[PDB]
Amino acid sequence: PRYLKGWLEDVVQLSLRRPSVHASRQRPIISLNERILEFNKSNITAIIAYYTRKSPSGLDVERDPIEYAKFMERYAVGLSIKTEEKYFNGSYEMLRKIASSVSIPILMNDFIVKESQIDDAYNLGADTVLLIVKILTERELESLLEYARSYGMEPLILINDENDLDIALRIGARFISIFSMNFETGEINKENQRKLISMIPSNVVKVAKLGISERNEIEELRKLGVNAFLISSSLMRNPEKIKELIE
Ligand SMILES: *C(C)CC(=O)c1ccc2cc(OC)ccc2c1
């Protein structure tokens, strides 16, 4: 990985030591990017629901992950499951249980820094993985994208700025999540997010992290060409709100 500081350095070093899982995948690869395009065609707002046991906002909500997943199976284009253990209190066992419980695409949301974590995702039933430009060398990012693709998974590449986009496009990214977030405050700079979106080629499937989890923000971004939306963990408090967000 890149050299990093603070808790991010800690979690990346912890992730390098993540024990691998020996398991047989229990389900097909259910492509997230393709389902997004299908929703676009059908004119259905495509929202990726996000589950994390512990939220960085400090407002943790008690929600049974299986109940949440089964509810979201009816509305969401896919699920993002935070599997990092130390700070977010996720687990591989939770991912496995969720994957065995629903038939919609599952994104393994973790700090992916080695090949065995992609093996883990595949073996556990995840349909794709997040790769984060800001924690990986370009060589690592390219190699991990290739490794995920070898499995039949199109990784979601997280970009935060123009530098990240330049690297992502060079290494062949076709499925990109646009944050443009101040890491220190957890706040999206909507102006910068929109500039980044405008720089992305038309043949890339685009997922925006919502800075404001409301229908107005979604409508504005969809007009700018965004294909799907990663919503806040706050939706765990009232899952039903996703009905409003989707129309
Ligand atoms: C969880 C797998 C992703 C997450 O929590 C996180 C934390 C910090 C961070 C910093 C970035 O740039 C400095 C990019 C992504 C990212 C993701």
List the chain domain ranges: 1-247
Would you state the structure tokens that stand for residue 43, as one six-digit string? 């004119």
Query: Cβ(154) to ligand 1 under 6 A?
Result: no
120 lines ligand 1 (CB under 6 A): no
Intra-chain end-to-end CA distance of the chain, in Å: 41
Q: In 10 A of CB 45, how many CB atoms?
A: 18
Structure tokens at 115: 């090949």
Q: How many CA atoms lie within 13 A of 223 on its CB side?
A: 6
This PDB structure is determined at a resolution in Å of: 1.3
Q: Does residue 209 line the site of ligand 1, with CB under 6 A? A: no
Nearest C-alpha to atom 9 of ligand 1 is from which residue?
Answer: 183
- Which alpha helices (H) appear in the chain, and where do they start and end? 6-16, 32-42, 65-72, 92-99, 115-124, 138-150, 162-170, 190-199, 215-223, 241-245
Are 177 and 189 in contact, with CB atoms under 8 Å apart? no
157 touches ligand 1 (CB under 6 Å): no
User: Determined by which method?
Assistant: X-ray
**Largest alpha-carbon pair distance within the chain?**
44
122 lines ligand 1 (CB under 6 A): no
Residue 9, number of CB atoms within 10 A of its CB: 14
Determine the distance separating the centroid of ligand 1 and the alpha carbon of 41, expressed in angstroms.
31
CA distance 103 to 119: 20
Phi/psi for 134 (5° steps) reads: -70, -10
Residues 6+ apart with CB under 8 A from 12: 1, 4, 111, 113, 135
Give the torsion sign (CA, 167, 173, 179, 185). negative
Q: Going by CATH, does the domain composed of 1-247 fall within 3.30.750.210?
A: no
Token pair, residue 15, equals 């992730």
Cβ proximity of 113 and 126 under 8 Å: no
Q: What CA–CA distance (Å, rounded) separates 195 from 22?
A: 43
Please provide the size of the chain in residues: 247
Phi, psi of 17 (to 5 degrees): -100, 10
Q: Identify which of 211, 146, 152, 192 has the alpha carbon closest to the alpha carbon of residue 173.
A: 146
Q: What is the DSSP letter of 200?
A: S
Count the neighbouring beta carbons within 10 Å of the beta carbon of residue 61: 16
Strand partners, 182: 187
Q: How far apart are CA 107 and CA 70, in angstroms?
A: 15
Spacing of C-alpha 225 from chain mean position = 18
Q: What distance in Å separates the CA atoms of residue 72 and residue 179, rounded to the nearest whole number? A: 23
DSSP 18: P
In one-letter notation, the amino acid at residue 36 is I
